[PDB]
Symmetry: C3
Subunit: 169 residues, 3 copies
């Protein structure tokens, strides 16, 4: 019944030690809160806004760590270096557009600037990958929008096969 | 100018005769109701949750049967075998994201679990393909969400070319 | 910090001189209104509903003209020749699904027929590309739905690199 979760902070500023990772730290707290998801933090990493590093991390976390859930924070806006959604599209097997939609409607309710977020959500093996905004406020609000559906989503994926492992098994 | 419709049930359980196809049978009734769509059922099949069989059936129904509308039911959730949207993306020529959106907003209005549905809608030749959920309740509600736009959508596609046929024409 | 905008009218009828481009002409007025966007019209063209012509124009306007914003009007519905979204998907580097969403929700609030529009929004270099409907009413409404986010989106993209130019720089 355990939920093993990874939080991937995608941020040049945090990577360069220019700012504290308020968003990522807060997501670790939200994830572990027994009144919320009641999950376990199994992976945490800060990476720069660089497609290959994001992709490699996601693949490792899905295929080697077999996490149930990865929450990315940052790299989903219009700034030129923001490529988290692009990295995510390259690693997912099955897209989950309803989750990206739920987050966008929720965000638009807060502000029209919500349409400047470009998140992708999708599945790889047993892992649900969710792109969240970079700000603490934004990532918390978006986590809140999807939380009601997370336990069931994770449950449906628990027995999925990790494709790269299954071929030599 | 009849509306020729195909209902494709994607279900391992129904395919193996473990359960009755409540969803598909109900969709046949909804399609044919003269107060609703007033369509004709021109094709009906139960297939397992297997990407190639889904793809092959959709292609035959669009290119050989030249159906105006295909309603798929099942294989659109998070369960590992659910690959209907993936099959659909491989066969469509032009995506219709507004229809997938309309269904998802309607569904989210019923329950946040609507974000665990992953439907694709799109066009191939004269055919509009709509992915609906596997459950009778979900497919009925989703059919209702798009019904007001179906007649006009179908009309706009009636004179489309079937690409594989036109090359030897 | 001018906003250099292109308006691309995709319309067989206008291209063949059968109708006046009411939509494109109105978009030029909207764009230049200082209480709306305060933009500059830097490019305007009417092209037929042909994928290659649309793609070639978009690439030229992004890569050679380095426009901040391109509004396309027409070619986004279900009619068989409507291929603007497909051309757009072939040229963008980063999709902006939030903006497409916002336009569609707004449109669905007016009529369910909004779900028969298939717009794509995305980014190439410094340029935001927005697909709008062909009708004057539809393009004006869709522009007005996204307008609140336009200034900030454009600003975030101002220092983006034009990839084809950077490689020989
Ligand atoms: Na999409």
């Amino acid at each position: 019944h355990q939920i093993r979760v990874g939080v991937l902070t995608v941020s040049d500023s945090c990577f360069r030690n220019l700012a504290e990772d308020r968003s990522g730290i807060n997501l670790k707290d939200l994830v572990q809160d027994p009144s919320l998801l009641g999950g376990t933090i199994s992976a945490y990493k800060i990476v720069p806004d660089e497609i290959e590093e994001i992709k490699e991390t996601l693949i490792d976390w899905c295929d080697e760590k077999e996490l149930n859930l990865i929450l990315t924070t940052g790299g989903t806006g219009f700034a030129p270096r923001d490529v988290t959604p692009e990295a995510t599209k390259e690693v997912i097997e099955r897209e989950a557009p309803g989750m990206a939609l739920a987050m966008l409607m929720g965000s638009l309710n807060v502000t029209p600037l919500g349409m400047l977020s470009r998140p992708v959500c999708g599945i790889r093996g047993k892992t649900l990958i969710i792109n969240l905004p970079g700000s603490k406020k934004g990532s918390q609000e978006c986590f809140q929008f999807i939380l009601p559906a997370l336990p069931h989503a994770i449950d449906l994926l628990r027995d999925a096969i990790v494709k790269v492992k299954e071929v030599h098994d």
